[PDB]
Design a binder for this molecule. Structure first.
Ligand SMILES: *[C@@H]1O[C@H](CO)[C@@H](O[C@@H]2O[C@H](CO)[C@@H](O[C@@H]3O[C@H](CO[C@H]4O[C@H](CO[C@H]5O[C@H](CO)[C@@H](O)[C@H](O)[C@@H]5O[C@H]5O[C@H](CO)[C@@H](O)[C@H](O)[C@@H]5O)[C@@H](O)[C@H](O[C@H]5O[C@H](CO)[C@@H](O)[C@H](O)[C@@H]5O)[C@@H]4O)[C@@H](O)[C@H](O[C@H]4O[C@H](CO)[C@@H](O)[C@H](O)[C@@H]4O[C@H]4O[C@H](CO)[C@@H](O)[C@H](O)[C@@H]4O[C@H]4O[C@H](CO)[C@@H](O)[C@H](O)[C@@H]4O)[C@@H]3O)[C@H](O)[C@H]2NC(C)=O)[C@H](O)[C@H]1NC(C)=O
Ligand SMILES: *[C@@H]1O[C@H](CO)[C@@H](O[C@@H]2O[C@H](CO)[C@@H](O[C@@H]3O[C@H](CO[C@H]4O[C@H](CO)[C@@H](O)[C@H](O[C@H]5O[C@H](CO)[C@@H](O)[C@H](O)[C@@H]5O)[C@@H]4O)[C@@H](O)[C@H](O[C@H]4O[C@H](CO)[C@@H](O)[C@H](O)[C@@H]4O)[C@@H]3O)[C@H](O)[C@H]2NC(C)=O)[C@H](O)[C@H]1NC(C)=O
Ligand SMILES: *[C@@H]1O[C@H](CO)[C@@H](O[C@@H]2O[C@H](CO)[C@@H](O[C@@H]3O[C@H](CO[C@H]4O[C@H](CO)[C@@H](O)[C@H](O[C@H]5O[C@H](CO)[C@@H](O)[C@H](O)[C@@H]5O)[C@@H]4O)[C@@H](O)[C@H](O[C@H]4O[C@H](CO)[C@@H](O)[C@H](O)[C@@H]4O)[C@@H]3O)[C@H](O)[C@H]2NC(C)=O)[C@H](O)[C@H]1NC(C)=O
Ligand SMILES: CCCCCCCC/C=C/CCCCCCCC(=O)O[C@H](COC(=O)CCCCCCCCCCCCCCC)COP(=O)(O)OC[C@@H](O)CO
Ligand SMILES: CCCCCCCC/C=C/CCCCCCCC(=O)O[C@H](COC(=O)CCCCCCCCCCCCCCC)COP(=O)(O)OC[C@@H](O)CO
Ligand SMILES: CCCCCCCC/C=C\CCCCCCCC(=O)O[C@H](COC(=O)CCCCCCCCCCCCCCC)COP(=O)(O)OC[C@@H](O)CO
Ligand SMILES: CCCCCCCC/C=C\CCCCCCCC(=O)O[C@H](COC(=O)CCCCCCCCCCCCCCC)COP(=O)(O)OC[C@@H](O)CO
Ligand SMILES: CCCCCCCCCCCC(=O)OC[C@H](COP(=O)([O-])O)OC(=O)CCCCCCCCCCC
Ligand SMILES: CCCCCCCC/C=C\CCCCCCCC(=O)OC[C@H](O)CO
Ligand SMILES: CCCCCCCCCCCCCCCC(=O)O
Ligand SMILES: CCCCCCCCCCCCCCCC(=O)O
Ligand SMILES: CCCCCCCCCC
Ligand SMILES: CCCCCCCCCC
Ligand SMILES: [Cl-]
Ligand SMILES: [Cl-]
Lengths: 207, 48, 48, 264, 284, 121, 176, 52, 103, 121
């Protein structure tokens, strides 16, 4: 999943009076200040893009409100139950939160209400054999050996498309069964021919 | 020739860049060349 | 045209010159026709 | 002499604020862009992306870096690009990219007397290109590169194609074994996100797939197998073993070639 | 002291040319145990800077004559930033050296030689001195001969074996012919795997295609024989059509098609192989 | 055949712990949830816990009820504290894949029989 | 600290380095990392797929001998958690074990911790894949015994087809 | 470092299949000469197995 | 091949007198002192392991004897002669030496 | 058939050069070595050169003799310097893949005829 991940927070140390209300600064300024140590709990191997430059933006408002957005490509775990395969559907999570700060230190909240706080681009669909029916946004707590952490979760609900497997396996199997059943219409004295029917259909089904 | 051809770069030397192949008609310069090559091939096939 | 010059054109050598393969192909035409008639006469001669 | 050039460069770099863009409170900075397409390597159907190597060059004006008394374009070592401000350009549909780094970082920085900066990078990027394969292998595919400013809105930065329609070069020297570049196009527009409006350049290519490979691989053997299927009609009706062998063979071979083809 | 001999520490301290390889798809230096670089500064101000590199360079191959193909793959480099008026490269007396040429990783190719050149390339930024080294490689026939040529000829001979079976052996001969045509489809399919998906015919493609026609002609020959045997049943002053053409007699001599084919098919295949190999090995 | 046994008290005046044990299928990779149904009211979501040990709670019972899972025993427990008269209801254990859910009962395919709980003042 | 049997590992770096530093008033440092590591596990496949595998992670100190650093599993057997939540598709974790010892090299003696897992391979996939087609083909091979001796073409075709199918099954197994 | 290749894998996966194919081809000599389709099946299938 | 590659050498500049005979130091000192620029002639993309920290150790003896060890996954060339395959045997080299410093 | 043709001087009072050219097989990819055998002595290793232009010398001849190779011509040369009357012997050219060897004669599968060398004071 490719995302613009936007965070925002208040820092009273960075309030200022100046000609403009908002300083749209270089991403270099982000490293010089505190930022949340957000990480994805179920992420496997993610990329923070830095082509040509670090794909980040930092904006400081006069009141001390900071906006900080990043461009990320997250490869996240989506465990599946394949008993209904290829007619199965899954709810792939995307869970994130602070790595080091517990509930008493840092708390995450959705900017808008959770339904509108996660937006998917209309043209942004790279799925081949799945339909993204929608998403559900929620939040919860996780208890670990180091304390309690707020975990903000989205669940993308995907339904597999059966057409590929219909072409791939079901139709060959159906016509193989029909091919085997064709042998019933040959006369019983065509022993080599009917044996050829049976053995070739068995080999095809095995393959 | 019929399909293949070599041409010099023109710096007082050989440097013959060579291109053309009957197995790829895209490289043959012209439709007349293609037809001539095909007819000579047909003649070779007949005598063989 | 790039290889030979501007004077070269359809059914016109221009600055370029025929080499051994073209005249050898003409000789091949003559030899093929001669051998064709030779084969015809041999076929009609075998029956006698 | 080199001492005067050294003093000029040190004066330019002294007191230079990399955090601020060339006109932080002023009108937006205009950035021209041009590209030299070195190659397009791997148009992958399974991955739905293509790899594109290019020389990507940006052009802008920074009055802080203007100098006088040196009638030359100072081509500086690429390390000073870290000290100087450059646009935060990025490719939206990127998947994996890097700047080549042998023997050094393949990066160019050139200053001119009027503060103009030319900033070049040798970049190879794997860009997503979702391909409609309904008419495959007789399909025609649009594949685009979407250049955009990340942090700077249209109030801060403007993009344009330097040289107009001649901004992108090298498109005619690309050799793709499977595809032919029938046309390329350049577009400039604005894109609105929740954080604001940003400038967007778009370099699009249209690729026509070559049919000869598929004629050699699939169409001819299928036709020939169908003809051998027809061969059974001239066999005697009582030759049941022979005719059934021919029919079963042709049927299972058509299934096998179809399935074996459509895995890749 | 006449020369300071130094490791990679001052490579970043002193000015270094920004040499880059133009046709590199992927290149990387060596950093184990330390950076594989060396610097040497002489009292006259001469700097020698050496480094180890591994480059994956692109080489557009024309595979029309594959596997009889030969290539001249380039390796080009130049200064990335500095135009011809700022940096100029130059080859030394013995510039490109090689060690054991045929102890390299070239399995499918043999190294014939190399040649270096220099030129000027005009770009938008300016004119740059480009330094090229071409390596000539010639493909080796052994692996492909094992993989495709020998099996295809053997399957063609297997098709020829059908001519010596009794024509009354209908299932045997039909299965033999169709099976030979199957094994050809499979051999064609696997012969292309090593190559990229080019849209032109190669020498291997032509050979396998002709082997296909010889195995299909054999099957069609048996089909015609079976159908016609069982299922169906003025200097001479001679007239020119009699003199030249044949309306006399002719068909009637159809049962002897097996006898004709037994000698015809091997002769045709031998002639095809002779012309093919001679043309691809000697005349071109 | 899959079963979800439940255990726990029936009447309190108050703290409680209602446990649920699964059989016939390992729910290590499923979300296990607790729901509540009062007389006349519709079934509502109390709590859920995911394979990643992440806990979701309803607004009505946030900070009071605590959900936990024993993955070795294939069980989900709910500790109830600060009971009130309106907490009287039938409490249901459920297991599911959380499709369109984690809060909707329709997303859970496996359901327990239910356990009555009553609070008396 | 380093993992001896490592082959390729990295600390997760999105959004930042998944790393934690926590100080306490008495000078106690807690240092956390989120690490994905590919560790070597040499498998004896003689009983494959009815086999059990030991796979271990060998935590060790590189530059500090036992005179400098002393490793231990804090919490004892409760040091490692989350094994119960692992659900592999092809394996089941029978048990896991923690060991603490010392390893001697030429340069000195170093502390070693070992976290080992025993994995039992699941048989259902292989039953669906290889065993049941082989049994079915072997059963089909006996159909020739019910056919007359004079049906040479049919019986030979059936036997040859069964042999070919067995060869294809073996081929598709060995390719993976 | 001196290394010697282990032959067991290739013995299992190449040599034994080839030897069994040769034996299967030679089995056809024991059938009656009038079993033309059967012996042709033997020869052709063994040839293709060797090719594969 | 996974190796502990150990090197040692005398450096008179790093002589000291103190309570300890040997200073078993952090690997950060290696970047600060001189070390040999050893490289593998037939290597091909070797890896210096860096989990959790750089897998290197440095030890300074009071007489100036340096011991410097590093963990590596060396990946080297083994040219092969497959005429007798699968009955073939080979001798894979591992050759290393200084890059910048001559004999 | 594969051969190794050796050439060089036979008598000296001194410097000398012994060449060994290989034909019938490409010995570029094999380690090429020089050995000595006086009468009533076992074949001893003098020098060798690998595919990577790396040279090994025996302790008796380190710094005196020098081995070089021409891979294009498929030959190995040995320049002998500081010849002494204890050095008189038969000199053999050998080549092979160095397996369990590179200093033992058993590892080389190809040998030359040999050339006599004598020093007279
Ligand atoms: C997008 O994001 C990416 C991730 O952030 C980013 O990639 C990173 O970019 C940075 C900046 O360009 C890279 O940093 C440079 O790396 C060079 C080396 O590159 C090779 O090695 C690194 C790993 O680096 C370790 O190993 C080398 C080799 O020994 C050391 O030199 C390093 O210090 C470092 O050592 C540590 O780690 C080791 C284990 O890895 C430990 O064993 C060791 O103990 C240390 O802990 C690889 O990552 C590189 O590969 C990648 O990049 C290449 C190139 O693109 C790709 O081809 C490849 O596929 C990979 O992607 C590669 O293998 C360094 O040389 C360089 O540092 C020198 O220059 C900088 C200034 O530019 C100095 O600050 C620095 O001090 C160095 O200079 C000193 O040393 C040199 C060498 O001796 C001297 O010549 C010089 O004069 C100077 O000497 C003085 O100081 C010395 C001490 O500093 C002193 O010893 C001397 O005596 C003297 O006083 C710099 O670190 C980084 O590697 C990239 N990759 C990653 C994964 O981080 C990417 O660029 C971003 N893209 C964009 C578009 O923004
Ligand atoms: C490959 O496939 C991609 C994907 O589809 C193709 O991409 C699209 O290419 C076309 C060009 O063929 C693009 O169209 C144009 O945009 C330019 C520039 O426009 C922005 O320009 C204005 C600001 O400078 C802005 O006002 C525009 O606004 C809106 O525009 C109009 C109303 O004004 C209307 O369409 C919408 O309301 C928009 O919201 C725009 O955002 C524009 O100049 C072009 O018009 C020209 O055309 C007009 C007639 O319409 C003419 O009068 C002018 O003189 C001029 O000639 C045109 O609208 C399109 O934006 C691209 N879309 C995306 C998503 O990238 C690509 O072309 C394909 N190429 C190949 C080679 O296959
Ligand atoms: C997977 O497969 C791996 C590979 O085989 C298994 O690895 C091994 O596990 C066993 C136990 O499961 C390990 O043996 C244990 O070591 C501990 C600790 O030993 C350390 O500390 C001791 C106290 O300081 C110290 O004395 C030890 O030193 C030597 O001492 C003993 C006794 O003299 C001697 O016999 C050994 O040679 C030691 O080297 C050591 O430094 C030890 O406590 C364990 O002991 C049990 O049994 C003894 C019996 O006397 C008893 O007294 C103890 O109280 C305890 O009950 C045991 O010996 C072994 O080291 C592991 N090997 C490796 C290479 O890691 C792994 O267990 C498998 N796991 C799974 C899940 O499949
Ligand atoms: C005697 C002679 C007999 C000869 C008869 C031979 C039979 C030959 C016909 C095959 C029918 C093939 C199905 C064609 C119609 C359906 C094909 C189709 O449209 O595909 C999807 C539905 O597939 C599906 O689930 C439906 C799959 C059904 C396929 C099998 C149907 C039964 C075949 C008959 C049984 C054997 C009869 C035995 C007679 C002897 C569409 O998805 P939908 O747009 O919604 O969303 C998108 C997402 O679901 C797919 O990307
Ligand atoms: C689809 C396939 C179906 C086929 C199945 C058919 C079923 C019947 C077969 C059972 C095979 C049993 C497998 C046995 C294991 C394979 C044999 C093996 O590798 O054992 C080694 C001996 O090898 C060796 O001598 C190597 C040579 C072995 C070659 C044996 C072939 C004999 C062929 C005779 C010709 C008969 C002609 C008859 C025609 C009438 C022991 O040495 P050692 O431990 O030191 O390891 C050193 C290192 O080389 C690794 O072994
Ligand atoms: C494995 C095969 C199995 C079946 C075999 C059956 C028997 C067939 C035999 C021979 C003819 C085969 C014809 C093959 C045709 C190949 C397909 C074809 O025609 O494709 C076009 C022509 O390509 C080309 O270069 C091909 C041009 C030359 C074609 C002819 C080559 C010589 C064939 C001499 C045969 C003599 C037989 C004599 C028998 C005794 C290219 O279009 P496309 O837009 O993609 O280009 C894009 C452009 O940019 C590529 O450079
Ligand atoms: C009756 C016909 C004989 C079929 C018997 C085949 C059989 O026993 O399969 C059982 C279940 O396999 C499976 O679910 C896979 C499906 C088996 C389908 C059997 C034929 C249909 C294995 O049982 P177990 O407890 O060891 O599995 C635990 C762990 O190893 C998961 O594999
Ligand atoms: C594997 C090769 C076996 C060669 C066997 C040589 C036997 C030569 C004896 C003469 C041929 C002959 O008269 O008998 C076979 C047939 C005619 O048989 P009939 O039915 O008329 O009695 O004769 C014919 O009609 C065609 C004979 C063709 C013989 C071989 C042609 C060359 C084949 C090249 C193989 C690579
Ligand atoms: C079935 C297994 C068949 C086993 C036999 C032979 C493969 C032929 C191996 C080598 C053939 C030499 C070809 C040749 O001499 O061509 C020169 C070319 O430059 C370089 O090969
Ligand atoms: C599509 C054709 C496939 C090959 C067919 C091979 C068998 C052809 C046999 C002879 C056909 C011509 C017979 C003409 C006599 C008639 O009118 O029936
Ligand atoms: C039984 C008669 C068969 C006649 C056809 C024989 C063709 C054999 C071709 C084998 C491959 C030849 C490869 C030659 C390579 C080379 O010349 O170096
Ligand atoms: C100019 C495009 C020509 C397309 C040729 C397609 C091959 C046809 C083979 C019969
Ligand atoms: C497709 C090729 C058909 C060949 C027919 C041959 C007819 C022969 C009539 C005597
Ligand atoms: Cl998908
Ligand atoms: Cl050609």
């Amino acid at each position: 999943i490719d995302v613009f991940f936007r965070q925002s927070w208040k820092d009273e140390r960075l309030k200022f009076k100046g000609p403009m209300t908002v300083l749209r600064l270089n991403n270099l300024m982000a490293s010089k200040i505190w930022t949340p140590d957000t990480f994805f709990h179920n992420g496997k191997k993610s990329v923070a893009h830095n082509m040509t430059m670090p794909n980040k933006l930092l904006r400081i408002t006069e009141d001390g409100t900071l906006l900080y957005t990043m461009r990320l490509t997250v490869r996240a775990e989506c465990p599946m139950h394949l008993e209904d395969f290829p007619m199965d559907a899954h709810a792939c999570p995307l869970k994130f939160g602070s790595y080091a700060y517990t509930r008493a230190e840092v708390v995450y909240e959705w900017t808008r209400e959770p339904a509108r706080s996660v937006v998917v681009a209309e043209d942004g669909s790279r799925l081949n054999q799945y339909d993204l029916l929608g998403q559900t946004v929620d939040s919860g707590i996780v208890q670990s050996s180091t304390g309690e952490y707020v975990v903000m979760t989205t669940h993308f609900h995907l339904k597999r498309k059966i057409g590929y497997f219909v072409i791939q396996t079901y139709l060959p199997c159906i016509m193989t069964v029909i091919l085997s059943q064709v042998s019933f219409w040959l006369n019983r004295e065509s022993v080599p021919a009917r044996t050829v029917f049976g053995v070739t259909t068995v080999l095809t089904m095995t393959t | 020739g019929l399909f293949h051809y070599c041409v010099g770069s023109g710096l007082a030397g050989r440097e013959l860049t060579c291109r053309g192949s009957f197995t790829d008609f895209s490289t043959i310069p012209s439709s007349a060349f293609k037809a001539a090559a095909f007819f000579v091939l047909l003649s070779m096939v007949l005598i063989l | 045209r790039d290889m030979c010059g501007a004077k070269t054109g359809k059914y016109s050598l221009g600055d370029c010159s025929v080499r051994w393969a073209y005249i050898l192909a003409i000789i091949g035409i003559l030899n093929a026709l001669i051998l064709s008639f030779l084969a015809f006469v041999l076929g009609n001669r075998q029956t006698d | 002499n080199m001492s005067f050039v050294k003093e000029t460069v040190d004066k330019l770099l002294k007191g230079y604020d990399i955090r601020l863009r060339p006109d932080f409170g002023g009108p937006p900075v205009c950035v021209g862009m041009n590209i030299d397409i070195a190659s397009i390597d791997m148009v992958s159907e399974v991955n739905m992306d293509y790899t594109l190597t290019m020389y990507f060059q940006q052009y802008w004006r920074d009055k802080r870096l203007a100098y006088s008394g040196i009638p030359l374009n100072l081509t500086l070592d690429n390390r000073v690009a870290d000290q100087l401000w450059v646009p935060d350009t990025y490719f939206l549909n990127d998947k994996k990219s890097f700047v080549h780094g042998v023997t050094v970082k393949n990066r160019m920085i050139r200053l001119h007397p009027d503060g103009t900066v030319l900033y070049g990078l040798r970049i190879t990027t794997t860009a997503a290109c979702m391909m409609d394969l309904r008419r495959y292998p007789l399909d025609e595919q649009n594949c685009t590169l979407e250049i955009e400013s990340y942090g700077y809105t249209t109030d801060d930065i403007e993009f344009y194609w330097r040289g107009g329609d001649k901004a992108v070069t090298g498109v005619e020297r690309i050799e793709l074994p499977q595809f032919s570049i029938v046309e390329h196009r350049l577009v400039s527009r604005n894109v609105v996100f929740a954080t604001g409006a940003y400038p967007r350049l778009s370099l699009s290519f249209r690729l026509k797939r070559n049919i000869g490979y598929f004629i050699l691989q699939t169409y001819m053997p299928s036709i020939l197998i169908t003809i051998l299927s027809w061969v059974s009609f001239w066999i005697n009706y009582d030759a049941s073993a022979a005719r059934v062998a021919l029919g079963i063979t042709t049927v299972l071979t058509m299934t096998t070639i179809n399935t074996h083809l459509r895995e890749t | 002291i006449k020369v300071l001999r130094l490791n990679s520490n001052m490579v970043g301290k002193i000015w270094i040319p920004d040499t880059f390889f133009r046709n590199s798809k992927k290149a990387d230096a060596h950093w184990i145990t330390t950076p594989n670089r060396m610097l040497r500064i002489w009292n006259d101000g001469r700097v020698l800077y050496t480094l180890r590199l591994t480059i994956d360079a692109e080489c557009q191959l024309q595979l029309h004559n594959f596997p009889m193909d030969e290539h001249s793959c380039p390796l080009e480099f130049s200064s990335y930033g500095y135009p011809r008026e700022e940096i100029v490269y130059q080859w030394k007396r013995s510039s490109v050296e090689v060690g054991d040429t045929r102890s390299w990783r070239l399995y499918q190719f043999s190294f014939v030689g190399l040649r270096n050149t220099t030129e000027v390339v005009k770009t938008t930024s300016g004119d740059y001195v480009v330094m090229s080294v071409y390596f000539d490689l010639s493909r080796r026939m052994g692996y492909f001969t094992i993989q495709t040529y020998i099996p295809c000829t053997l399957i063609v001979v297997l098709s020829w074996v059908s001519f010596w079976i009794n024509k009354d052996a209908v299932p045997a001969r039909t299965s033999l012919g169709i099976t030979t045509v199957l094994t050809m489809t499979t051999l064609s399919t696997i012969a292309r795997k090593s190559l990229p998906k080019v849209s032109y015919v190669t020498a291997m493609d032509l050979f396998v295609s002709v082997c296909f026609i010889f195995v299909f002609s054999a099957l069609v020959e048996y089909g015609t024989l079976h159908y016609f045997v069982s299922n169906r049943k003025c200097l001479d002053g001679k007239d020119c059509a009699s003199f030249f053409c044949c309306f006399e007699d002719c068909h009637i001599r159809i049962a002897k098609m097996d006898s004709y084919a037994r000698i015809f098919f091997p002769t045709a295949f031998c002639l095809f192989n002779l012309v093919y190999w001679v043309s691809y090995l000697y005349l071109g | 055949q899959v079963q979800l046994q439940e255990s726990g008290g029936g009447l309190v005046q108050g703290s409680l712990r209602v446990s649920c044990a699964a059989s016939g299928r390992t729910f290590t990779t499923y979300i296990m949830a607790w729901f509540r149904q009062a007389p006349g009211k519709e079934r509502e979501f109390l709590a859920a816990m995911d394979q990643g040990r992440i806990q979701y709670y309803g607004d009505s019972v946030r900070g009071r009820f605590t959900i936990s899972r024993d993955y070795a025993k294939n069980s989900v427990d709910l500790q109830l504290d600060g009971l009130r008269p309106e907490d009287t209801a039938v409490y249901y254990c459920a297991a599911g894949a959380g499709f369109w859910g984690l809060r909707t009962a329709s997303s859970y395919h496996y359901w327990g029989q239910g356990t009555q709980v009553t609070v008396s003042s």
